[PDB]
Design a protein around this ligand. Structure first.
Ligand SMILES: [Mg+2]
Ligand SMILES: [Mg+2]
Ligand SMILES: [Mg+2]
Lengths: 456, 44
RNA sequence: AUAGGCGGCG
């Protein structure tokens, strides 16, 4: 009825934003933070998104409040997202006259001079608006968000807004491939473009600095960190990426300072907690190296405090975002480090049921579970099961290569207890095949086949 | 031993990768009920 | 969206 009119509207309700129930507390928290701390030109988008999240929570009057706040801030065409959200709001509540009121407002603006004249309207602004909503709703929406901004840059290649959106989506997709071999810095030129056209935007400067750092250009990146830190623009966000920059440079204490300052503004940020975990992890590794694995007295004291601190923050991260895979894995591994194998295991079992956006993250999950099964749980069969499972995920990566090598070591261990084993001989043949060592691959497979026929 | 012999033929021609595939098919079958899961990886 | 210590007859 009116419902087919609603389905033509370009707004949050029709954009199929991929939002697990599990990610909802976290998303709302990130929406509130952005509203308070992100320096942008139009804050209408994020309140429209706050509205949608309230609506998914079952709090429609709060959702209405957020739409009224967005309206009170409202080019004018971006109001259309607000109005379409209003239309859906009033529908879902059951104010069919009020919904219709707002549909009619959308239609009247859609007659200057829109092609689908009815409720959809095609302009750069609503494209960007779909981009940013997708870009805030988690990694699975990122290819789509990139395409939205890219659509607009196909037409207007010097659009400052969509150049930003495009460059941030790209940097984050680049992020997913840092673990793959033969990753290319696809976001480096877009970020340079984006900084040129949004010269005041510190958020974009710090990601550029991080990309520069990944490509070995530390000096140039550090200038962007120092610049970004000297401007108000998005102080709290600049703090997070500046901290990441200094940690990867090896100024861990400087990182902590920034992260802890940022935690006052945004206590809830799983990014912060995770990254603060990584600072403590890196300090644990420093002490372990300087004391040759045998810390005593005060050193042991400090190592223990840092293991507790990392666990505290990785725990704080996954409580707030249960689907935060990498944070679960780091927690599993901190638990191993602390001697808590059940806690390790428990985090490993939750990891085994996840569908990561980043396929390589499942390789890491199996690799590290397999090592947990070899060295902590003393179960070779499960090590092998899981090293094989990591190997089976096709993607070339350092971690897959690690799994091949871990399988090799374990099977050569087994063959030196018991050389006449059909599985072990076939496994070692397999490993050699995955190394590209084909003479040996065939030699071990042949031995296994000849072992079979001799046994019969 | 049909798959062994198919392997040797590829090996003797230089198709090391088809040689591996042939042997895998037979070693898969032998190891289909192996606890590691290697038998299934071979029969894919 | 928040990556890379060393990896086992160590
Ligand atoms: Mg998050
Ligand atoms: Mg890191
Ligand atoms: Mg990590």
């Amino acid at each position: 009825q009116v419902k087919d009119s609603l389905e033509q509207l370009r707004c949050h309700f029709t954009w199929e934003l991929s939002i697990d129930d599990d990610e909802m507390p976290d998303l709302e928290n990130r929406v509130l933070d952005q509203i308070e701390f992100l320096d942008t030109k139009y804050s209408v988008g994020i309140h429209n998104l706050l509205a949608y999240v309230k609506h998914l929570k079952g709090q429609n009057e709060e959702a209405l409040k957020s739409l009224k706040e967005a309206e009170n801030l409202m080019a004018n065409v971006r109001s259309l997202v607000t109005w379409g959200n209003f239309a859906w709001m009033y529908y879902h509540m059951g104010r069919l006259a009020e919904a219709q009121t707002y549909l009619d407002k959308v239609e009247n603006i859609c007659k200057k001079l829109s092609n689908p004249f009815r409720y959809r309207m095609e302009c750069p602004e609503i494209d960007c608006e779909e981009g940013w909503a997708l870009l805030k709703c988690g990694g699975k929406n990122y290819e789509r968000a990139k395409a939205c901004f890219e659509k607009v840059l196909e037409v207007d290649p010097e659009n400052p807004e969509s150049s930003a959106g495009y460059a941030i989506s790209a940097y984050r997709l680049d992020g997913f491939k840092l673990a793959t071999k033969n990753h290319k810095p696809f976001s480096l030129l877009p970020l340079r473009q984006a900084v040129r056209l949004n010269p005041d935007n510190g958020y974009i400067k710090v990601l550029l600095a991080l990309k520069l750092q990944d490509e070995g250009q530390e000096a140039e990146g550090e200038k962007y960190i120092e610049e970004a830190l000297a401007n108000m623009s998005s102080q709290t966000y600049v703090f997070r990426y500046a901290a990441k920059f200094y940690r990867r440079k090896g100024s861990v204490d400087k990182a902590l300072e920034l992260l802890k300052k940022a935690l006052q503004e945004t206590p809830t940020s799983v990014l912060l907690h995770h990254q603060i975990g990584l600072c403590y992890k890196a300090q644990m590794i420093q002490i372990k190296e300087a004391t040759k694995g045998q810390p005593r007295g005060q050193n042991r004291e400090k190592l223990d405090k840092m293991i507790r601190s990392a666990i505290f923050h990785f725990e704080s991260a996954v409580e707030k975002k249960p689907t935060f895979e990498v944070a679960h894995l780091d927690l599993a591994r901190m638990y191993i480090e602390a001697g808590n194998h059940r806690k390790a295991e428990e985090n490993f079992q939750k990891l085994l049921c996840m569908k990561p956006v980043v396929e390589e993250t499942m390789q890491d999950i199996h690799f590290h579970y397999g090592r947990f099964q070899e060295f902590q749980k003393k179960s070779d069969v499960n090590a092998i099961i899981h090293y094989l499972k990591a190997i089976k995920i096709e993607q070339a990566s350092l971690t897959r290569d690690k799994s091949i090598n871990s399988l090799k070591k374990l099977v050569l261990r087994k063959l030196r207890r018991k050389a006449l084993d059909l599985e072990s001989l076939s496994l070692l043949g397999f490993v050699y095949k995955l190394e590209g060592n084909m003479n040996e691959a065939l030699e071990y497979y042949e031995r296994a086949l000849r072992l079979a026929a001799d046994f019969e | 031993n049909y798959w062994y012999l198919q392997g040797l033929i590829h090996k003797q021609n230089g198709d090391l990768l088809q040689a591996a595939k042939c042997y895998e098919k037979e070693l898969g079958r032998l190891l289909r009920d192996a606890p590691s899961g290697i038998g299934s990886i071979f029969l894919s």
